[PDB]
Design a protein around this nucleic acid. Structure first.
Lengths: 255, 49, 325, 319
RNA sequence: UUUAGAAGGAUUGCCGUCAGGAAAUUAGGUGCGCUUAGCAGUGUACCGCUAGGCGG
DNA sequence: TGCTAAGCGCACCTAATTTCCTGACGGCAATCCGC
């Protein structure tokens, strides 16, 4: 209908999630694509049909909530737990679970295909990005929602692209050993959570959030990614994370 | 429990964490020098629980 | 009929406070000058003056106790503290992120619209603006202060400022024009007549020249180091959003024994303030019973109980049924 | 009331600022001030530490290189200037945590009874006596021709103090300036005045190019002398000024034998005279379990000690 | 429709005392900075006769 | 309201050696478990 690219420039996320079972750092990519699909579903409910099918993930600044020890490691803080539903809900001190939190300044380049993609849609996103959360964190402020044309209006920042060929072509053993060897060879490469693989079959269990949609138990699957500057990014379309489904695999891929 | 896009519809995904993976990561990152963070959060009572 | 709560009922926050950042200023140039306030490391040598068993006392009463700490103090030439934080008011009906049963969603939406009809989130909003205008968010930074000045800027309108030492911390005023002006917009944001409200609060506390500033302390569990690890936001001192939010939710004056203990408590589920160690609303005036008497065994509860239930739903949380196996 | 609360804590009521050091000339002391900075001083030594007989043979004539730091006046300055200020806060508005409300009511009742008897006046006179005698100048009071301590509250500079004319083992109760400042601290401690900010400036005429001793910082792992730098210049910890302001306790059981004040601590520990002086029934724990948990009209000296620790603060919490 | 949704980390403190860094020195040699031009742009802007327009 | 255009800014040799780098005492109390 009308393809285009909207950039949500310098979104300051406060206290997002950072724990994905073996990772403390950058949130999952399913969380940012969930911000995308939540923005899509709230715009499509103001009668603005816009199907978002590809998201760029640029990074300008971060602060993992904690401190850096003298030995150069990281200690992650947590808020004091309050009343947590359960058997011990009336006790004044609650149990502390595994949780990590991060602060990010990110810019999201979206691949938007709608009937009309104009600056009125940008105003709609501005009036829609102030009732949503990125990962599980609040948006303090955003710089500007603008339409971009090519890879020159994009601000300076370091994108996140999937580097699976640096993980398949690795030392040996099992995939964890390949990951550890690959992170030893390239020190500018990070583990990233990239989606889910089912542990059961599609069906109805009791306790679901929505009792009418299909349900499947999942593990998180993880891979490698790295950072590339905005200047040295070739034909965009390689920083655009997109949904991709298979039989048993719920994956986020850069094609 | 989270939603995931499957072909114009959605599938609810209730994520179960992996204990054995976390154990294998903790074994194979003590003997390594890649960036690593120790999560000193779970007490022994809740770990027993 | 409705015979229970949904198997996954969830609610999001409707008063989303942001992290705070601490600045150091003068008072006769508080509108133009602004300097960064940094958190220093202060190591201490102490004595073992804690209670210990009478056998350990004979072995350790005159033993040095070195400890690690951090501290934030002002400069020798700046006498005031500038804290700037922001809030994101959101609608209450549009903060239900999850509900399994459709009939419970219909019933709860009917009860929120009935609350919009009678006192449409206005008394609660006036109490939230009082907890901005008495500066309860200055937890230990409100003690020993000559002048406290609080400024609220909704959208881009800068409202007339507050003398936050002329408000009592145990009495909520319902007559100040600025508070009513802010509170009507917060009430309209909670009703759903506005989809979002951005409030920016800036405080000016004249404590004294080189005096101690008290940031929020971070819970950091490290075996090697066990010291006062204070909060540094973008390199400078500050406060968590949870501390400021717990200050703003101290509006509950409708608990079963308010006439004895005459102080507002934070709005929790079982009435669990972290100062007094007894639950203040433990059986009959708890949120779970006072929402199962409102939505399930339909009944017109008193307006104070409706205030408490709506204040919990503005606080938000996991509000489902006792999950079974 | 049986047992103290599980979370009981108190905040300070005498907040002392960190100290900054300056250099002046004494005849130009009211119009002239310069920064005093810390200088690194590497020193070569002999191995004079006591060694076992199988190490001394090999390392008695071995050089000992050691790192260190120092602070010294200039060759044109004869006076050290120390500037700190004290925030006086009320005593009832200083309980930071109390899980029981009955215990809060009992503490407020006993503080109100003490306000009825002596309106925190003997304690405040002792505090202004430790501002006027200049006990905060720990090793900087040794070898000084003239020490002048000026105290400024609000915008009134009170008449200056000949700090060297004050014995450190006695407490004057007949000085007009000490009584006038102590009455304001007394009314601030009682509750009549909500806060009092008292700014202290002391001039120490020690001499030309003489050594100024700052507070040394604490090192934990495996170090040298690291002295305190407050805003670039030399300075002292607030902890060290407050331990010289709380040297007011002449109420311990063995005072008639050792006739000097000690700092006010829970178990009566004194690091100068290395003996505990309150290890038993005259400690704070057994004087707060016999003033509120089992109501007993304690002697007034013991009441002075309990309110002095409630001005000091701490985590006084039972399991 | 985001490992969804929720969360007060708090109170208190004396780091101290002491010290020899020290002895010796070769930086040297060599060298093309050149060519050319309007301080011009009127170079100024005053002396008189409510807003506005005017003798020389 | 202008303030120039043009070329280029070394080749060598090296940068010390001995003795050592403290002794003490100590590093908190509370609370964070579902069944």
């Amino acid at each position: 209908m009308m393809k285009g690219y909207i950039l949500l420039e310098k979104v300051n996320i406060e206290n997002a999630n950072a724990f994905n079972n073996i990772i403390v750092g950058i949130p999952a990519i399913t969380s940012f694509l969930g911000f995308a699909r939540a923005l899509e579903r709230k715009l499509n409910a103001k009668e603005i049909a816009i199907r978002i099918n590809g998201v760029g993930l640029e990074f300008h600044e971060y602060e993992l909530k904690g401190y850096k020890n003298k030995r150069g490691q990281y200690v992650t803080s947590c808020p004091l737990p309050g009343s947590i539903p359960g058997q011990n809900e009336k006790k004044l001190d609650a149990h502390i679970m595994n949780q990590a939190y991060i602060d990010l300044n990110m810019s999201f380049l979206l691949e938007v295909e709608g009937p009309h993609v104009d600056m009125s849609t940008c105003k709609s996103i501005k009036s829609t990005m102030e009732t949503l959360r990125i990962a599980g964190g609040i948006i303090r402020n955003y710089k500007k929602i603008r339409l971009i044309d090519t890879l020159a209006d994009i601000p300076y920042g370091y994108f996140l692209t999937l580097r699976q060929d640096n993980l398949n072509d690795a030392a040996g053993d099992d995939m964890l050993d390949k990951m550890i060897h690959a992170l030893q060879q390239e020190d500018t490469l990070v583990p990233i959570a990239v989606g889910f693989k089912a542990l059961s079959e599609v069906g109805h269990v009791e306790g679901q959030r929505d009792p009418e949609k299909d349900h499947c138990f999942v593990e998180s699957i993880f891979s490698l990614g790295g950072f590339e500057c905005s200047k040295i990014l070739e034909d965009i379309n390689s920083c655009l994370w997109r949904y991709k489904t298979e039989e048993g695999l719920y994956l986020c891929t850069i094609i | 429990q989270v939603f995931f896009p499957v072909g114009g519809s959605y599938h609810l995904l209730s994520i179960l964490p992996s204990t054995v993976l976390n154990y294998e990561v903790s074994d194979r990152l003590y003997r390594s020098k890649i960036p690593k963070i120790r999560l000193r959060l779970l007490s022994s009572n809740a770990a027993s629980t | 009929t409705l015979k229970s709560r949904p198997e996954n009922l969830s609610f999001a926050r409707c008063l989303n406070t942001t992290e705070a950042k601490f600045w150091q200023t003068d008072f006769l140039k508080r509108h133009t000058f602004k300097l960064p306030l940094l958190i220093t490391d202060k190591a201490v040598l102490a004595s073992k003056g804690h209670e210990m068993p009478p056998d350990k006392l004979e072995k350790e009463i005159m033993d040095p106790n070195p400890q690690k700490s951090q501290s934030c103090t002002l400069s020798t030439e700046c006498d005031t503290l500038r804290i700037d934080f922001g809030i994101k008011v959101l609608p209450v009906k549009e903060s239900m992120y999850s509900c399994s049963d459709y009939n419970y969603r219909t019933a709860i939406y009917q009860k929120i619209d009935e609350y919009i009809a009678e006192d449409g989130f206005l008394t609660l909003a006036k109490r939230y603006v009082n907890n901005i205008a008495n500066a309860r968010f200055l937890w230990r930074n409100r003690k020993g202060a000559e002048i406290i000045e609080t400024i609220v800027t909704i959208e881009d309108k800068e409202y007339p400022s507050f003398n936050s030492k002329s408000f009592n911390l145990d009495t909520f005023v319902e007559d100040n024009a600025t508070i009513n002006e802010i509170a009507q917009q917060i009430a309209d944001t909670f009703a759903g007549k506005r989809e979002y409200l951005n409030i920016y609060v800036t405080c000016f506390v004249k404590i004294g020249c080189a005096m101690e500033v008290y940031p929020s302390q971070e819970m950091t569990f490290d075996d090697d180091d066990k010291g006062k690890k204070l909060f540094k936001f973008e390199g400078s001192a500050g406060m968590h959003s949870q501390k400021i939010n717990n200050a703003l939710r101290t509006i509950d004056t409708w608990y079963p024994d308010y006439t004895t203990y005459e102080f507002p408590i934070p709005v929790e589920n079982y009435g669990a303030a972290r100062s007094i160690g007894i639950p203040f609303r433990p059986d009959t005036k708890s949120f779970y019973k006072l929402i199962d008497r409102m939505i399930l065994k339909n009944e017109d509860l008193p307006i104070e109980d409706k205030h408490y239930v709506m204040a919990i739903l503005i606080r938000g949380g996991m509000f489902s049924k006792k999950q079974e196996k």
